[PDB]
Amino acid sequence: WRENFPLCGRDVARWFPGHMAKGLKKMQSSLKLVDCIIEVHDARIPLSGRNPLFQETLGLKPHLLVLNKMDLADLTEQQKIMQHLEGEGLKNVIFTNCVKDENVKQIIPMVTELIGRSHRYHRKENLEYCIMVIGVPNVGKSSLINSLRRQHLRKGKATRVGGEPGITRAVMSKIQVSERPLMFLLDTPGVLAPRIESVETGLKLALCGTVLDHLVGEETMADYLLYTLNKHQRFGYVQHYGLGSACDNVERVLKSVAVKLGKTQKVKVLTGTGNVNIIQPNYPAAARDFLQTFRRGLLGSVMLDLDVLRG
RNA sequence: GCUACCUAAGAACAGCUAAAAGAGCACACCCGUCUAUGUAGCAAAAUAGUGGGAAGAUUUAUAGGUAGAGGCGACAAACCUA
RNA sequence: GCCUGUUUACCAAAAACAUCACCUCUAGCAUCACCAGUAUUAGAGGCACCGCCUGCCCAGUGACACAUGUUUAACGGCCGCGGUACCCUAACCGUGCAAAGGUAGCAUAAUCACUUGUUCCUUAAAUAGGGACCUGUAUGAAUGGCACCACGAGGGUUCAGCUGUCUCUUACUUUUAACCAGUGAAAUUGACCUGCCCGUGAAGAGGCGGGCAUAACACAGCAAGACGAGAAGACCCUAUGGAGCUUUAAUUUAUUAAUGCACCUGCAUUAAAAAUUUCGGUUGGGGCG
RNA sequence: ACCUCGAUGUUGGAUCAGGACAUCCCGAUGGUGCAGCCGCUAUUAAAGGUUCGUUU
Ligand SMILES: *P(=O)(O)OC[C@H]1O[C@H](n2cnc3c(=O)[nH]c(N)nc32)[C@@H](OC)[C@@H]1OP(=O)(O)OC[C@H]1O[C@@H](n2ccc(=O)[nH]c2=O)[C@H](O)[C@@H]1O
Numbered sequence: 001w002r003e004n005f006p007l008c009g010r011d012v013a014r015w016f017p018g019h020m021a022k023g024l025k026k027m028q029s030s031l032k033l034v035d036c037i038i039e040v041h042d043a044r045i046p047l048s049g050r051n052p053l054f055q056e057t058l059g060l061k062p063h064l065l066v067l068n069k070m071d072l073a074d075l076t077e078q079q080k081i082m083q084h085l086e087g088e089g090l091k092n093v094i095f096t097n098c099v100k101d102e103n104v105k106q107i108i109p110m111v112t113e114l115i116g117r118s119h120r121y122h123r124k125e126n127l128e129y130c131i132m133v134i135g136v137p138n139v140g141k142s143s144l145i146n147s148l149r150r151q152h153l154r155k156g157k158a159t160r161v162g163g164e165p166g167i168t169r170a171v172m173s174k175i176q177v178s179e180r181p182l183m184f185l186l187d188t189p190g191v192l193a194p195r196i197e198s199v200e201t202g203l204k205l206a207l208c209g210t211v212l213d214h215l216v217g218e219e220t221m222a223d224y225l226l227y228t229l230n231k232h233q234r235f236g237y238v239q240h241y242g243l244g245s246a247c248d249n250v251e252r253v254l255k256s257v258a259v260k261l262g263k264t265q266k267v268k269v270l271t272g273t274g275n276v277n278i279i280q281p282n283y284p285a286a287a288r289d290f291l292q293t294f295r296r297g298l299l300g301s302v303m304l305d306l307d308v309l310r311g
Numbered sequence: 312g313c314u315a316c317c318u319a320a321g322a323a324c325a326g327c328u329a330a331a332a333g334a335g336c337a338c339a340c341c342c343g344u345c346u347a348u349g350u351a352g353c354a355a356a357a358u359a360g361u362g363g364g365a366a367g368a369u370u371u372a373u374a375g376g377u378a379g380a381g382g383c384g385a386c387a388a389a390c391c392u393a
Numbered sequence: 394g395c396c397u398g399u400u401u402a403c404c405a406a407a408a409a410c411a412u413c414a415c416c417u418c419u420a421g422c423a424u425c426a427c428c429a430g431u432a433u434u435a436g437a438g439g440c441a442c443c444g445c446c447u448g449c450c451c452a453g454u455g456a457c458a459c460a461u462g463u464u465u466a467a468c469g470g471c472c473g474c475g476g477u478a479c480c481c482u483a484a485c486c487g488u489g490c491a492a493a494g495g496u497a498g499c500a501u502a503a504u505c506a507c508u509u510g511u512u513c514c515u516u517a518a519a520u521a522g523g524g525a526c527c528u529g530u531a532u533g534a535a536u537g538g539c540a541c542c543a544c545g546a547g548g549g550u551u552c553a554g555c556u557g558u559c560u561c562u563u564a565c566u567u568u569u570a571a572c573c574a575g576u577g578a579a580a581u582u583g584a585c586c587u588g589c590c591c592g593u594g595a596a597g598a599g600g601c602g603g604g605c606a607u608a609a610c611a612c613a614g615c616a617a618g619a620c621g622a623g624a625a626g627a628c629c630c631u632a633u634g635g636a637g638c639u640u641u642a643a644u645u646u647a648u649u650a651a652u653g654c655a656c657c658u659g660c661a662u663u664a665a666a667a668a669u670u671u672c673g674g675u676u677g678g679g680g681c682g
Numbered sequence: 683a684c685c686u687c688g689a690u691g692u693u694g695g696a697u698c699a700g701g702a703c704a705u706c707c708c709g710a711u712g713g714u715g716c717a718g719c720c721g722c723u724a725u726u727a728a729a730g731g732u733u734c735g736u737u738u
Pocket residue numbers: 018019021022023025693738
């Protein structure tokens with residue numbers, strides 16, 4: 001740990017493919033079949049960047065927030081997470097975990113009276129509550145369909161689940177979720193943003209895996225773990241990957257893990273005499289494997305919002 | 312007499328790494344992933360390269376068996392003389 | 394998707410089918426499959442190796458009720474210190490002192506008498522109970538979901554190299570080519586002495602109208618037109634034209650399987666297997682009359 | 683529902699582009715709330731030109 005991040009004109013990365021451009025006009029074509037809107041985010045990013053569009057555009061149905069990924073999260077400061085959301089205007093938040101289905105039972109109260117607290121306009125006679133989940137990629141929207149299908153319908157899996165952003169393609173059909181009070185979920189492709197706030201807020205959202213690692217950079221994401229595992233005093237990468245004691249240079253930490261994993265690469269280096277090939281430790285493969293252990297949870301439960309928690 | 316499966320009694324499977332592996336590399340063999348040529352063609356489905364398997368749920372010679380309201384089928388509602 | 398395998402000979406090799414393992418169903422048995430077998434077997438299937446946990450459709454009173462824990466109980470070694478002994482070897486006395494203790498009530502698995510159920514009489518409404526008696530009151534289950542260790546001519550993504558893929562093509566060689574010689578097809582083809590522009594027209598003209606152009610013929614290229622050639626468009630519709638398949642469509646039960654007034658045979662009932670025949674007209678995309 | 687169901691093949695792309703001008707640039711002018719620079723608009727002009735990538 002030396003100081004903060006020298007971004008030095010890093011510039012925001014931007015990924016807006018045909019998923020979110022086409023999805024938005026198929027999401028906005030279907031607000032007559034929606035009784036509630038579910039916001040699903042990472043618990044690593046509750047406050048800093050949620051979404052530019054989704055907050056103020058969608059106001060007709062009331063909001064409920066589902067901050068998923070609570071197993072890789074420390075909630076000693078749960079009291080003030082509510083504080084920044086209460087001051088925003090966001091009232092109810094349900095933190096969920098989706099391997100033991102922890103606190104996933106508790107939402108099934110908290111949707112039923114919420115539609116009852118408000119008006120329904122057209123669907124005054126319908127007993128079937130068709131509700132919609134929307135959000136940025138890779139946060140827990142498709143697993144929320146399958147966890148809620150598991151513990152209430154006791155039926156099974158209805159949506160493809162496996163960790164890489166963008167392998168669900170478009171707006172699919174309805175999915176039965178429960179028999180006790182009836183409720184249908186609509187699955188959406190993850191609309192992230194046309195523009196992503198600032199540069200620092202861009203990397204906080206890019207770190208959880210919601211964007212491909214190519215447009216941002218594997219070693220660019222690699223140094224930002226060293227910002228958040230050394231300045232937070234959460235030195236939790238030194239019992240799995242303990243190199244000598246602890247380091248803050250991205251050059252040194254990608255060195256020693258490549259020895260421990262046995263990584264080799266053959267790179268055309270460009271010296272002044274000509275093009276020669278030198279065998280090097282595989283710095284992208286070291287930047288890959290250092291990022292996967294972060295997402296598995298074998299590096300420590302971290303908050304990414306300590307920079308905005310200061311004050 | 313093709314083909315699908317079966318019966319009878321037969322045959323084939325180098326070298327290499329490993330040891331009793333429906334193991335790995337790889338011939339002979341079997342199959343046909345991709346490309347190109349070919350499209351009245353060499354061929355009513357082939358050639359050249361690249362590929363999958365190649366001691367096994369393998370491949371194959373010979374003789375027999377099941378026949379159409381049927382046979383046979385590791386279901387492609389495939390195959391039963393184009 | 395577990396894997397090796399398997400499949401549409403001739404447009405699909407796959408994520409499909411198969412696969413151990415697991416689960417459900419049927420069968421207590423001989424001489425022609427199963428099988429010269431016998432429930433750890435055989436058949437019919439489902440799912441896909443192994444791995445992980447979710448509680449249960451015995452209705453009552455009251456008592457049985459476990460360590461673990463709680464209901465709650467005494468005394469002394471090494472050594473330290475103050476003294477009395479005294480060349481010394483070092484002693485003696487008076488003390489301080491850790492752990493060590495597990496009677497025994499009690500939420501609390503062990504298993505059962507009791508309006509409690511059967512049956513039968515009064516009302517001839519159930520007056521609302523009298524009885525007669527007693528039901529070893531059969532082990533209290535057993536099904537869904539998750540899950541990457543390898544593997545893959547599977548579907549995506551990526552690091553690095555690499556190379557005419559590309560920027561931007563070039564050179565050469567062979568085949569082809571063109572020409573000379575020999576042999577010699579095929580689709581195609583109303584007749585054509587077969588131009589361009591604008592207009593026209595069955596709505597896109599070589600042929601019609603008004604202009605324009607125009608000696609005649611070979612050879613090599615080109616692919617804009619001849620709605621170019623090949624195959625009575627696979628999409629849409631029609632036919633009281635077919636066929637495959639499925640049923641809770643109609644008509645049937647001869648046929649097999651059961652019983653009826655040992656098998657056979659003759660008439661009935663309930664099923665299984667099927668057989669035969671059709672699927673009006675008017676809006677078809679409807680946001681589902 | 684007019685031509686074609688005795689076959690008029692389906693978007694973009696590659697290649698080659700022919701044309702219109704209702705002009706995006708270059709050229710020539712009128713007006714400006716046109717100081718200069720940038721512009722805005724109109725007239726005139728089709729000779730020439732109109733890039734390379736990321737994303738299924
Ligand atoms: P990649 O090379 O990006 O894929 C190319 C795509 O071509 C498609 N396509 C061919 N012909 C089409 C057509 O007549 N009409 C459409 N709408 N698309 C056509 C196309 O879609 C089928 C391809 O990409 P994908 O299949 O991956 O889907 C993206 C596709 O979605 C459409 N879209 C995106 C965003 C938005 O705001 N509106 C849209 O309509 C685009 O067509 C886009 O290509």
